[PDB]
Design an enzyme around this catalytic site. Structure first.
Site, PDB file in Angstrom:
ATOM      1  CG  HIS A  48      42.799  56.954  26.073  1.00 13.42           C
ATOM      2  ND1 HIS A  48      41.851  57.435  26.944  1.00 13.42           N
ATOM      3  CD2 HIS A  48      42.226  55.946  25.376  1.00 13.42           C
ATOM      4  CE1 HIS A  48      40.733  56.756  26.778  1.00 13.42           C
ATOM      5  NE2 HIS A  48      40.949  55.816  25.831  1.00 13.42           N
ATOM      6  CG  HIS A  71      34.346  59.969  20.166  1.00 15.77           C
ATOM      7  ND1 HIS A  71      35.562  59.329  20.250  1.00 15.77           N
ATOM      8  CD2 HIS A  71      33.419  59.013  19.949  1.00 15.77           C
ATOM      9  CE1 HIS A  71      35.371  58.031  20.084  1.00 15.77           C
ATOM     10  NE2 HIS A  71      34.067  57.823  19.900  1.00 15.77           N
ATOM     11  CG  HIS A  80      38.752  62.667  19.905  1.00 19.45           C
ATOM     12  ND1 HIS A  80      38.001  61.998  20.845  1.00 19.45           N
ATOM     13  CD2 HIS A  80      38.373  63.952  19.967  1.00 19.45           C
ATOM     14  CE1 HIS A  80      37.208  62.855  21.447  1.00 19.45           C
ATOM     15  NE2 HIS A  80      37.420  64.049  20.927  1.00 19.45           N
ATOM     16  CG  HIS A 120      37.129  52.233  26.263  1.00 21.06           C
ATOM     17  ND1 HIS A 120      37.019  53.075  27.372  1.00 21.06           N
ATOM     18  CD2 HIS A 120      38.111  52.747  25.485  1.00 21.06           C
ATOM     19  CE1 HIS A 120      37.871  54.072  27.243  1.00 21.06           C
ATOM     20  NE2 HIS A 120      38.576  53.886  26.093  1.00 21.06           N
ATOM     21  NE  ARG A 143      40.083  55.875  30.466  1.00 17.92           N
ATOM     22  CZ  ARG A 143      40.686  57.044  30.364  1.00 17.92           C
ATOM     23  NH1 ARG A 143      41.982  57.155  30.593  1.00 17.92           N
ATOM     24  NH2 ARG A 143      39.978  58.113  30.033  1.00 17.92           N
TER      25      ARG A 143
HETATM   26 ZN   LIG Z   1      37.492  60.021  20.702  1.00 21.27          ZN
HETATM   27 ZN   LIG Z   2      38.874  55.437  25.230  1.00 20.42          ZN
END
Ligand SMILES: [Zn+2]
Ligand SMILES: [Zn+2]
Ligand SMILES: *[Se]c1ccccc1C(=O)Nc1ccccn1
Ligand SMILES: *[Se]c1ccccc1C(=O)Nc1ccccn1
Ligand SMILES: [Cl-]
Ligand SMILES: [Cl-]
Ligand SMILES: [Zn+2]
Ligand SMILES: [Zn+2]
Lengths: 153, 153
Positions: A48, A71, A80, A120, A143
């Site tokens: 992130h 994504h 990403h 996650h 998270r």
């Molecule tokens: Zn992503």
């Molecule tokens: Zn994530």
């Protein structure tokens, strides 16, 4: 060879240590370690944007995305930079992690030092879920644990 | 330009959020925030070498010292890059932190992103205590809280 490390902590029992090592600029990063206290099966595993833990893992912001793409899975061209896919927890709730990735870097504008690694709640659908959330977060949910990515010995 | 953040945590009561901001690539870094849960008086305040929390604050290693110098106060020519001197906790146990330093950087050779900020048990003696401990650690004693320095929004 740049060596970096991340200690994952959160509100619950999920914790781990992930190492990163890159031999050259634009070359592959080896990513290895272990995470314990997970539910058995797939857990989304992402870099992130922000190394900011001021409000737990929430303050880490979205997946690190300097190319402003959708994504995907780590093997997709459309992904990403932070998209490292899934880790697998065995029945004892331990994920041995071993990944090689050529999109993340430990130098340059794709550099992940000072950003946050997050594990996650749920599987990353790798952008194949057919909803808006799929192409942002992979529907990987909350998270569980995160760490700022720091320089190691 | 560059804004970074550090959340200080440990095994005791010491907690804080420290911001760093640098307007120009090589110019001064503004350091501000607050730390609570401290004893009234001076506390050593240092950037340590490794952004490594694998074994709590102990894994952060020594003061960040790329020029291989001895320990000093921030105003000494002979100092570690990581030597930011002391912070002052009031009777309430709260240090309101505000420092400007031109030896630490958020870019280049003296960059502290991905390294560890530590707040110590006792005063930093600025290398004037007359022993080995003084000219390495300033006798600031135990590491009460630390965090990896990360990219902020
Ligand atoms: Zn992503
Ligand atoms: Zn994530
Ligand atoms: Se690797 C890292 C982490 C945080 C901030 C900057 C960098 C970095 O290495 N950036 C950079 C700029 C220019 C050339 C090479 N690297
Ligand atoms: Se600021 C930082 C932190 C960790 C590793 C690299 C860097 C960095 O910015 N390095 C760098 C390279 C080239 C030009 C400017 N900075
Ligand atoms: Cl493995
Ligand atoms: Cl001084
Ligand atoms: Zn120290
Ligand atoms: Zn020092």
């Amino acid at each position: 060879a740049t060596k970096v490390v991340c200690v994952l902590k959160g509100d619950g029992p999920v914790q781990g240590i992930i190492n990163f090592e890159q031999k050259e600029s634009n070359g592959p990063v080896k990513v290895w370690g272990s995470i314990k206290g997970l539910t058995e099966g797939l857990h989304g595993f992402h870099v992130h944007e922000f190394g900011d833990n001021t409000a737990g893992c929430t303050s880490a912001g979205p997946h690190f995305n300097p190319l402003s793409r959708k994504h995907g899975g780590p093997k997709d061209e459309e992904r990403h930079v932070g998209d490292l896919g899934n880790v697998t927890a065995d029945k004892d709730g331990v994920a041995d992690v071993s990944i090689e990735d050529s999109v993340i870097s430990l130098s340059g504008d794709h550099c992940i030092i000072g950003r946050t690694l997050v594990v996650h709640e749920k599987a990353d659908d790798l952008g194949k879920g057919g909803n808006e959330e799929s192409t942002k977060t992979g529907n990987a949910g909350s998270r569980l644990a995160c760490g700022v990515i720091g320089i190691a010995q």
